[PDB]
Design an enzyme around this catalytic site. Sequence first.
Site, PDB file in Angstrom:
ATOM      1  N   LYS B 120       0.801  -1.238   0.000  1.00 47.01           N
ATOM      2  CA  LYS B 120       0.000   0.000   0.000  1.00 47.01           C
ATOM      3  C   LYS B 120       0.837   1.293   0.000  1.00 47.01           C
ATOM      4  O   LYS B 120       0.401   2.322  -0.535  1.00 47.01           O
ATOM      5  CB  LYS B 120      -1.028  -0.005   1.153  1.00 47.01           C
ATOM      6  CG  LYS B 120      -2.144  -1.000   0.883  1.00 47.01           C
ATOM      7  CD  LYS B 120      -3.090  -1.199   2.057  1.00 47.01           C
ATOM      8  CE  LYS B 120      -3.885   0.026   2.410  1.00 47.01           C
ATOM      9  NZ  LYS B 120      -4.733  -0.326   3.568  1.00 47.01           N
ATOM     10  N   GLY B 168      -8.286  -6.126   5.791  1.00 43.60           N
ATOM     11  CA  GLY B 168      -9.304  -6.474   6.772  1.00 43.60           C
ATOM     12  C   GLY B 168      -9.463  -5.434   7.864  1.00 43.60           C
ATOM     13  O   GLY B 168     -10.342  -5.546   8.709  1.00 43.60           O
ATOM     14  N   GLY B 169      -8.608  -4.416   7.852  1.00 47.72           N
ATOM     15  CA  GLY B 169      -8.656  -3.391   8.880  1.00 47.72           C
ATOM     16  C   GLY B 169      -7.667  -3.646   9.999  1.00 47.72           C
ATOM     17  O   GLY B 169      -7.656  -2.945  10.996  1.00 47.72           O
ATOM     18  N   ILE B 207      -7.726  11.722   8.176  1.00 47.90           N
ATOM     19  CA  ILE B 207      -8.810  12.613   7.782  1.00 47.90           C
ATOM     20  C   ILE B 207      -9.968  12.520   8.769  1.00 47.90           C
ATOM     21  O   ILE B 207     -10.398  11.425   9.151  1.00 47.90           O
ATOM     22  CB  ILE B 207      -9.278  12.333   6.345  1.00 47.90           C
ATOM     23  CG1 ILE B 207      -8.096  12.516   5.395  1.00 47.90           C
ATOM     24  CG2 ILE B 207     -10.406  13.296   5.952  1.00 47.90           C
ATOM     25  CD1 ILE B 207      -8.343  11.944   4.037  1.00 47.90           C
ATOM     26  N   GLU B 279     -10.140   3.087  -4.239  1.00 50.17           N
ATOM     27  CA  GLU B 279     -10.733   3.642  -3.024  1.00 50.17           C
ATOM     28  C   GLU B 279     -10.225   5.037  -2.679  1.00 50.17           C
ATOM     29  O   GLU B 279      -9.017   5.308  -2.676  1.00 50.17           O
ATOM     30  CB  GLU B 279     -10.526   2.714  -1.837  1.00 50.17           C
ATOM     31  CG  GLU B 279     -11.227   1.366  -1.944  1.00 50.17           C
ATOM     32  CD  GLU B 279     -11.148   0.627  -0.618  1.00 50.17           C
ATOM     33  OE1 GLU B 279     -10.699   1.276   0.358  1.00 50.17           O
ATOM     34  OE2 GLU B 279     -11.501  -0.578  -0.535  1.00 50.17           O
ATOM     35  N   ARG B 296      -9.097  -6.741  -7.619  1.00 52.43           N
ATOM     36  CA  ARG B 296     -10.020  -7.862  -7.681  1.00 52.43           C
ATOM     37  C   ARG B 296     -11.445  -7.329  -7.640  1.00 52.43           C
ATOM     38  O   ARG B 296     -11.665  -6.167  -7.312  1.00 52.43           O
ATOM     39  CB  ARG B 296      -9.816  -8.793  -6.484  1.00 52.43           C
ATOM     40  CG  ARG B 296      -9.936  -8.075  -5.122  1.00 52.43           C
ATOM     41  CD  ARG B 296     -10.099  -9.054  -3.943  1.00 52.43           C
ATOM     42  NE  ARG B 296      -9.937  -8.372  -2.664  1.00 52.43           N
ATOM     43  CZ  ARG B 296     -10.785  -7.465  -2.179  1.00 52.43           C
ATOM     44  NH1 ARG B 296     -11.872  -7.142  -2.861  1.00 52.43           N
ATOM     45  NH2 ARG B 296     -10.545  -6.868  -1.014  1.00 52.43           N
TER      46      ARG B 296
END
Lengths: 443, 446
Positions: B120, B168-169, B207, B279, B296
């Site tokens: 990421k 998944g967080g 944010i 996203e 995906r």
Amino acid sequence: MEIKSILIANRGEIALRALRTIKEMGKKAICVYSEADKDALYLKYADASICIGKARSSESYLNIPAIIAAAEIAEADAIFPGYGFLSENQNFVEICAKHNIKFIGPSVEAMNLMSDKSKAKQVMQRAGVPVIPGSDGALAGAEAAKKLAKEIGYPVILKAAAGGGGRGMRVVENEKDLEKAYWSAESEAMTAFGDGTMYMEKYIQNPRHIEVQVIGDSFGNVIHVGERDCSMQRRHQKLIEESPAILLDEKTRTRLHETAIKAAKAIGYEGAGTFEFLVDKNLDFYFIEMNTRLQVEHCVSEMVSGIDIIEQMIKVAEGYALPSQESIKLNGHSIECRITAEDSKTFLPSPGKITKYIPPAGRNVRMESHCYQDYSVPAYYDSMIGKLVVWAEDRNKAIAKMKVALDELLISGIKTTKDFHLSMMENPDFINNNYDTNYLARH
Amino acid sequence: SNAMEIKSILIANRGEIALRALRTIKEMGKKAICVYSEADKDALYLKYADASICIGKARSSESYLNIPAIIAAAEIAEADAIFPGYGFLSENQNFVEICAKHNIKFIGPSVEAMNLMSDKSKAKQVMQRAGVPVIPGSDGALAGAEAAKKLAKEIGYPVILKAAAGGGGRGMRVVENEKDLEKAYWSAESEAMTAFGDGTMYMEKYIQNPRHIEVQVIGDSFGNVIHVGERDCSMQRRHQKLIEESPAILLDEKTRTRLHETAIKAAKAIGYEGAGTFEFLVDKNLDFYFIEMNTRLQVEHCVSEMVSGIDIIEQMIKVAEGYALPSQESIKLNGHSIECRITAEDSKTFLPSPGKITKYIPPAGRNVRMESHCYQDYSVPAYYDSMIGKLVVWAEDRNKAIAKMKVALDELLISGIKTTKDFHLSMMENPDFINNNYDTNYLARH
Ligand SMILES: Nc1ncnc2c1ncn2[C@@H]1O[C@H](COP(=O)(O)OP(=O)(O)NP(=O)(O)O)[C@@H](O)[C@H]1O
Ligand SMILES: Nc1ncnc2c1ncn2[C@@H]1O[C@H](COP(=O)(O)OP(=O)(O)NP(=O)(O)O)[C@@H](O)[C@H]1O
Ligand SMILES: C[As](C)(=O)[O-]
Ligand SMILES: C[As](C)(=O)[O-]
Ligand SMILES: [Ca+2]
Ligand SMILES: [Ca+2]
Ligand SMILES: [Ca+2]
Ligand SMILES: [Ca+2]
């Protein structure tokens, strides 16, 4: 003139169908049931449910005082009749009005103009609508029929003016059969509808059955929501319906829509209704009748048009204007398959308890059914399990989509027509659109 | 392209997505091959499949993650392509290469594009070079806890620490003040090691009260990229999606147009083929920032299907066979669509409720899609995946879609286990939801 609460004077899949639209609009949905239908699924969903009588199901739902008293105790200000039962009962429509209950459907004047099929034909000639050649109004009797049949040319078909559900009709090939056929259709009509008035028309060989859905409002506007092909018929009963009817070229399709709108405006028609036509090999079309109510196969028209027809029926009854015809966009292709609790070869009823029920689902699959696992279907009285409706971008994809859905329908405990529809989806005649109202009769 | 025609597809997945893929595959006339662990022998789609291979011991979700077993299944069934769905191997670069080694078409992006977006922190760097706005933060991975301290002061608090290999967080910590920073860095770094075998951390500005908006794209082997509109997925619980919708009415047309062009530009920059999602977070001034790309299909794709009329999986498969996608101009976005995730968990506590479903009657009707693999008598192992199904509706506008959701939810009848049905029904009646005043933290402050 907002309607706040609507009683659904019907049962089965149309009750649930109506209920869903009514509740999405924020109105109250009142259901009625006979003692036989106390397990009906939609009774769980309704704002109130009123038992209206004994399980002589046909009877109780036809019991006008019971339906009226239910509307009043439940404080419905409108009744939705659906199809069958009281939806074309002129006496009911008048009675509703006397109790200041809004019948969602057309005026008695219009319902009366089209209620007798021989007169309906004359009303259509006056409007400039093509009709099949035959008697001008009802036949005086079996001897007028003999005279007429010779002029028209055999074969002819005798039809009950008060007829419905394919009952009271006889196709006649030779003069030597006529008198017997006349009295056989007369008797059947006498006992079945209390009226044995007959008319006659030319018998079209292998016609396509094509119908136009209209809705009219209180301002005199009438729109069409496309045409449906309902040619796949067994004993004059509809099994499979499609929109659009690809047999029709663009030009003929436009003529037909315009013809149907014109007929509606000519009789002051308000609400949802259908004009049925027969179309011959010339692509010539003939009015055969008008149904003054919503029909079973209206869903096919909803998926190609994006219209909720029941919602429009309600808005028209409330004094609203229909949308412009220019805003109705017809797209793609839709097929409906009626799933009934009958054997797929004999079409003999198969009543019993559903022990497994797994309905199809997926993109653009619509299973319209009130059934569920452990529900008992009384097939003698309504063998309808549900209507399986699909939409795709064209007819081939709709057929492929319908076959996958039918395969996914899992029902145990009773027989269904599922296997009939599956084998139809694989039938080259069906795929190639080479069939007609008598196709099943000769296979 | 005709030599690239796929005749047979193995669905290396389970649950509602195996069923959803199966339907599209069979409507196209291709063979659908399913796989299952022993705990999934009762799965509904195994009855609809053309063939089903048992691939191993249930307990371990490992069997679905067992590459040799999956490849062996594909080969015994003579599948020429594998549809991976989401989760499991859908983002496993090694599985992708292995597929190409056995001459099996992986339905999804190339290993290159997937590798570019998989870390990421590196992905943000790729987006910047493509001229895509990103959130101010670290330039690549942080060197460690001290580099974090220095950087948080520069960019200013609050900050969020994020695991480059996260998902998944997990491996994320919001940091509001320097005093909390070091403990937060190590808590996340160690979670990330355990969960992902990689502890690499990056940092970005946190944010406040963000809206989460994502754009669905599909790319083809000709370099065409289309979008299918954008989805608002702001109603989250612990950074988990519960309700998704399209379009995002928060946005004005000018911002919507800019967000669509940015997603399209981003996908071309990386040569993206297949279905994918960009996203973004949207702040109080309606500025948007890329946070990540999902290489995906996602769970909530059905929302974009209903507003666009596109079968996304069908397009995925055409793309894998070498076809060109439809033109952007032919894609028409209409009306409004909402999805509620129905799970086998208590509506108040969200604790799992495993058990047997003794009554199952799904909703239906016009423009209602219940995407579910459950049925009456099915046992839901909610400890392992608590998804019962996704309820998706469409209507002409947002308020009509919300009223349709309420009726569809009211008609969902399930017994024998608790569900989140009541959670959803109460959201449909929640004025903040109706008025569009919420954000990713709304549930946390309620
Ligand atoms: N003049 C005709 N020529 C050829 N076939 C005809 C003719 N009239 C009727 N039929 C066939 O009979 C079917 C039904 O005729 P119809 O006039 O609709 O009677 P019905 O008993 O009112 N129908 P319904 O009550 O709606 O089930 C048609 O769909 C045709 O298949
Ligand atoms: N810079 C940020 N500021 C505020 N909130 C953020 C920020 N980054 C992430 N979040 C929140 O955390 C959620 C998930 O972030 P994400 O980067 O997608 O992590 P994740 O573990 O990959 N997501 P996923 O695996 O798909 O569930 C977002 O939807 C936001 O709610
Ligand atoms: C149903 As009738 C033939 O009386 O119009
Ligand atoms: C390996 As990743 C953080 O792109 O899911
Ligand atoms: Ca009739
Ligand atoms: Ca008829
Ligand atoms: Ca992620
Ligand atoms: Ca994410």
